[PDB]
Design a protein around this nucleic acid. Structure first.
Ligand SMILES: [Co+2]
Lengths: 370, 129
RNA sequence: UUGAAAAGAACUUUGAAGAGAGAG
RNA sequence: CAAGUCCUUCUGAUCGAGGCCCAGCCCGUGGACGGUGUGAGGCCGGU
RNA sequence: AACGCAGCUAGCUGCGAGAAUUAAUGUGAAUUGCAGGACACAUUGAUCAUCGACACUU
């Protein structure tokens, strides 16, 4: 077992050749059983026994989360205003590739690195020729994910340079942490939405002499993660009045939380860059040779994971966004264009992937940074 | 009693012009009274509403002592929106409630170049009388 | 010609739905 | 370009009902009309 | 009389390839179903009205 170099280059598995990877923050489930605590499963009964039955699955999440932690520390180390996010995304992606030692689909990037600026919320990454220099008075949402054998971990944070945004950052961080602690086994999603809205709205923001009230973006919400499936079909809300579905043992969730000094809703603003093949659709005929070729290329290289046009240009494929929209109309791939708020507004996001262990709740994405 | 032969008192005629009025006219009917403190200091009784004025509700279910600011002047529906004049939608969102400008009181004006000229023009007409 | 104002019925449940039962 | 959204009370909301030193709330050369959550000289446009 | 003109627009309406309008003047912060676009509002401007300049397919 060796150690990591100052510019992170050693693969995570090389740092832990034993096979066991650092555990996330273990937390007992909330005492939502009418006062009765859940500190009765931590004892090594059959609960722990069947927890051990899925130990190998967890280790993949652990290594992915560790890789995410090192990558985000590296990004925090050198990120600064004045440099465009094309090279920022290139650096983040290449560092993550080296740290995860990607090989086909057994390991690699779960989805393109999102870097949303100002009113933009999510699902934005620069395309080819995108000349956007960063500014001192900017806020950015760095959302990126890594996976091991399809065990996806999703985490996101917000970077700021002007110290006028710390109130909004702390509000969104508190909302995300409250959603984290509120989540548990056999709890309704409407409850977590209740908690998130009741913690996050009780904050006030003073920006540029104007006092705003921070509100959730009712359009976005958290999601459940599946095997090579970023969205398993369950969405945890961040506003009041949602579904009454429960969370069950053995599932993983991404507890996202967005806060804006705007209208609390988002729409499609600029050119789409994120794309995702549908996990549920089967075989749909195609009539264009270029479209067929692009489809088989993407299903070989990106499978069901999300991809961006940069990842296709990185593969040497050109003249392809045509067949790409063709797959979009055919329903094979669903575009995910950037979501943006009103101009002049600001948005902050913090995200963590949580594990519902039989004995406890592990937030594998937890780090010392946040 | 009205004596002008060229001004009508017909019910249907007056209603038609009020319901079918251009927005720049509609701003004139979009008028609200100033509070006693502005009225005494500016010597002006009523002023057209604007997008950002401190406004107090004096009639309706939302009548109270709190001060709010206009956020939208919906001239089509002859209503305006304040922050805390909201009600709870069924699904969970929150929507504004339209309040007619004649049922509020302006507690602070959007002091502006055109605005500043508007008060003194009305005020200087008072010392004429 | 709903209603002062959509506040135009969240959510739960049966049904493939149209349709219901609760709730608001 | 005049004067009540004064006080108490009805209402879902009211422009409704009582009171308003001086024989009488305030303006009236303005008590036409329309709008405003009933029915308004004095809330608003007007007159 | 015909045919076209709106980001999403069939009818009604308005308009004419400068095509739900250009210019100018008055006015002075909106239009609105949604989104976007606006918006020092004078180092001068959204909307509306007026309309004398320009333009006006068969
Ligand atoms: Co996510």
């Amino acid at each position: 077992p060796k150690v990591q170099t100052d510019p992170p280059s050693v693969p995570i598995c090389d740092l832990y050749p034993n096979g066991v990877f650092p555990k996330g923050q273990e937390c007992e489930y909330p005492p939502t059983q009418d006062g009765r605590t859940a500190a009765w499963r931590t004892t090594s009964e059959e609960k722990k026994a069947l927890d051990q039955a899925s130990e190998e699955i967890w280790n993949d999440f652990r290594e992915a989360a560790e890789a995410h932690r090192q990558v985000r520390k590296y990004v925090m180390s050198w990120i600064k205003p004045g440099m465009t996010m094309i090279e920022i995304c290139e650096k983040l992606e290449d560092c993550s590739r080296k740290l995860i030692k990607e090989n086909g689909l057994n390991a690699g990037l779960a989805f393109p690195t999102g870097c949303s600026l100002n009113n933009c919320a999510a699902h934005y990454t620069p395309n080819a020729g995108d000349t956007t220099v960063l500014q001192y008075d900017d806020i950015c949402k760095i959302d990126f994910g890594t996976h091991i054998s399809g065990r996806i971990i999703d985490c996101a944070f917000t970077v700021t340079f002007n110290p006028k945004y710390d109130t909004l950052l702390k509000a969104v961080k508190d909302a995300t942490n409250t959603g984290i602690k509120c989540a548990g086994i056999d709890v309704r999603l409407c409850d977590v939405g209740e908690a998130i809205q009741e913690v996050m709205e009780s904050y006030e923001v003073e920006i540029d002499g104007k006092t705003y009230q921070v509100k959730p973006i009712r359009n976005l919400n958290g999601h459940s993660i599946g095997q090579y499936r970023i969205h398993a079909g369950k969405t945890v809300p961040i506003v009041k009045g949602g579904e009454a579905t429960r969370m069950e043992e053995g599932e993983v969730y991404a507890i996202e939380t967005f806060g804006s000094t705007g209208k609390g809703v988002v729409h499609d603003d600029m050119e789409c860059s994120h794309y995702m093949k549908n996990f549920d659709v089967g075989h749909v005929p195609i009539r264009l040779p270029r479209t067929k070729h692009l489809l088989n290329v993407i299903n070989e290289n990106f499978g069901t994971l999300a991809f961006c046009r940069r990842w296709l240009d990185r593969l040497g494929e050109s003249k392809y966004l045509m067949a790409l929209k063709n797959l979009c109309d055919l329903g094979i791939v669903d575009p995910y264009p950037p979501l943006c708020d009103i101009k002049g507004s600001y948005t902050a996001q913090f995200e963590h992937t949580i594990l519902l262990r039989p004995t406890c709740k592990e937030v594998v994405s937890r780090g010392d940074d946040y | 009693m009205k004596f002008n032969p060229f001004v009508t008192s017909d019910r249907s005629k007056n209603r038609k012009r009020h319901f079918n009025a251009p927005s720049h006219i509609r701003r004139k009917i979009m008028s609200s009274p100033l509070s006693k403190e502005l009225r005494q200091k500016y010597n002006v009784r009523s002023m057209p509403i604007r997008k950002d004025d401190e406004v107090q509700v004096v009639r309706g279910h939302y009548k109270g002592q709190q001060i709010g600011k206009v956020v939208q002047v919906y001239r089509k529906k002859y209503v305006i929106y304040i922050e805390r004049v909201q009600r709870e939608k069924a699904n969970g969102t929150t929507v504004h409630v339209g309040i007619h400008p004649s049922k509020v009181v302006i507690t602070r004006l959007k002091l502006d170049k055109d605005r500043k000229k508007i008060l003194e023009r009305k005020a200087k007409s008072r010392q004429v009388g």
